[PDB]
Design a protein around this ligand. Sequence first.
Ligand SMILES: C[C@@H]1C[C@H](N)C[C@H](c2ccncc2NC(=O)c2ccc(F)c(-c3c(F)cccc3F)n2)C1
Length: 274
Amino acid sequence: PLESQYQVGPLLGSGGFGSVYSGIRVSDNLPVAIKHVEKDRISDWGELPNGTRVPMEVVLLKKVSSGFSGVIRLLDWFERPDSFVLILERPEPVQDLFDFITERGALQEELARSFFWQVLEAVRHCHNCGVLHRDIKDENILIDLNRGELKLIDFGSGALLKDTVYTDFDGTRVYSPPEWIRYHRYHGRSAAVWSLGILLYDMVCGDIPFEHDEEIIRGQVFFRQRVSSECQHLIRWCLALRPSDRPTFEEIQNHPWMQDVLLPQETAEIHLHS
Ligand SMILES: C[C@@H]1C[C@H](N)C[C@H](c2ccncc2NC(=O)c2ccc(F)c(-c3c(F)cccc3F)n2)C1
């Protein structure tokens, strides 16, 4: 049984993704997050190695499970008559990047560099494991405040990574690329790089650059805060209108703005513990 193994704590939040609760594993008192999703609300379904019908999210989290701590670990999962329940690792203390940015405003470039580098390492891990997240954004990034380590969450809009065109999308529209808005078509890696440009702008400006479809299509970036020329260049490159003009993960990590990154513990020491 599920509610014999886990002591349910308060509701953390709910939305399109389902309902997420704080929890504790009864046996060892390990902090967990308990995600409930109704079967009717799941459009994308996957197949487990031994042919079991499960939400894509379970397939994807299983593919990215390893010792690497840049992706939230799926500890267990359960099927109920009209729902699925996922048990996820829960760092303590933790804060999502959206709340962190709301609280602190625009981030110092040294902090934004450390955070962006860790999300690039996490997204490269997903891609290397054949997983495309499709909803990279501040709300889907968790900060392990004690360790200065960032974790990617919510693979509910994800898909298996492929080299052919995607014509389906259920991620966040203001992080979606102009090829999706205009043609309902995009390729995995270049669409991920566009969302990364949106995220980097969000970190250094304290808000997203585009709100309307017309602004995404135009792709003209206005800087509302003081941002270095090198950081502005990387953002504008990730936000290139033509998908083939966007940098690869290697070109982002070799960019001059990305050099001399702080270690996660140094990041926590300078920017989080203080
Ligand atoms: C209340 C959340 C708001 C987010 N901005 C989004 C979170 C989310 C959305 C969709 N699917 C799954 C998720 N959550 C998770 O997998 C998950 C896993 C481990 C965690 F430590 C947390 C968590 C959090 F994210 C914020 C505060 C406290 C937490 F425990 N969440 C729910």
